[PDB]
Amino acid sequence: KNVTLTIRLLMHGKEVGSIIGKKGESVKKMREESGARINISEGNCPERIITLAGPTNAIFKAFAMIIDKLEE
Amino acid sequence: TLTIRLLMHGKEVGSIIGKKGESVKKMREESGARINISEGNCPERIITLAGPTNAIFKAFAMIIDKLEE
RNA sequence: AACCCUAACCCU
Numbered sequence: 138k139n140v141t142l143t144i145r146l147l148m149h150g151k152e153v154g155s156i157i158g159k160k161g162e163s164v165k166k167m168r169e170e171s172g173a174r175i176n177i178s179e180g181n182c183p184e185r186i187i188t189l190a191g192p193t194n195a196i197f198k199a200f201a202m203i204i205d206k207l208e209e
Numbered sequence: 210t211l212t213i214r215l216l217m218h219g220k221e222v223g224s225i226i227g228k229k230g231e232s233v234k235k236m237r238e239e240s241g242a243r244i245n246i247s248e249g250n251c252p253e254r255i256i257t258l259a260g261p262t263n264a265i266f267k268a269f270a271m272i273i274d275k276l277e278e
Numbered sequence: 279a280a281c282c283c284u285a286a287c288c289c290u
Contacts, residue, residue, distance in 0.1 A: 138277065138278070139277065140277075142273065142276050142277060144215060144217075144272075144273070144276070145215065145216040145217070146213060146214065146215060146216070147214040147215070147216045147255060148214075186216060193273060193277060196273060197269075197270070197273065200269060201266075204211065204213070204262060204265065204266075207211065207213075208211065208262065220286080222287090222288075222289095223285095223286055223287045223288075224286085224287060225287090225288095225289090226287060226288050226289045226290095227287055227288090227289080228286085228287050228288095229287080229288085229289080230287085230288065230289030230290080231287090231289090232287080232289090233288090233289050233290080234289070234290090237289090237290080243290095244289090244290080245289095245290065246288080246289065246290075248288090248290095249288095250288080
């Protein structure tokens with residue numbers, strides 16, 4: 138019954154663009170406020186992977202915030 | 210309307226569908242999201258959630274509970 | 279349902 142999970146989102150490169158933010162200030166604020174480990178596959182490859190990992194709830198905040206940005 | 214794709218190991222997809230797809234039928238009915246699970250007995254599989262923000266959230270929550278189990 | 283459990287669960 139693990140309390141840490143890892144979910145991988147599969148994402149287009151323009152989408153990843155806004156998740157990171159100018160100088161990476163979005164995903165930085167997403168790291169601080171969610172408490173989830175967030176990792177973004179490097180290389181401006183157009184089809185990229187986002188790895189959220191952490192306590193269920195940290196996962197879920199980082200996800201809310203990622204959705205909240207794609208709809209922004 | 211939103212589309213998120215989740216990238217998932219095949220042993221995880223197993224519990225997401227459930228015995229006879231009972232569990233993923235529950236999710237489709239309760240979240241009101243569209244859920245599609247890529248085809249195959251392919252070890253690395255893509256789950257598409259499509260729908261208004263809340264459907265997405267409900268499906269995602271429900272998918273998170275299954276991996277936690 | 280059943281002496282009916284686990285492990286794998288395959289839907290649209």
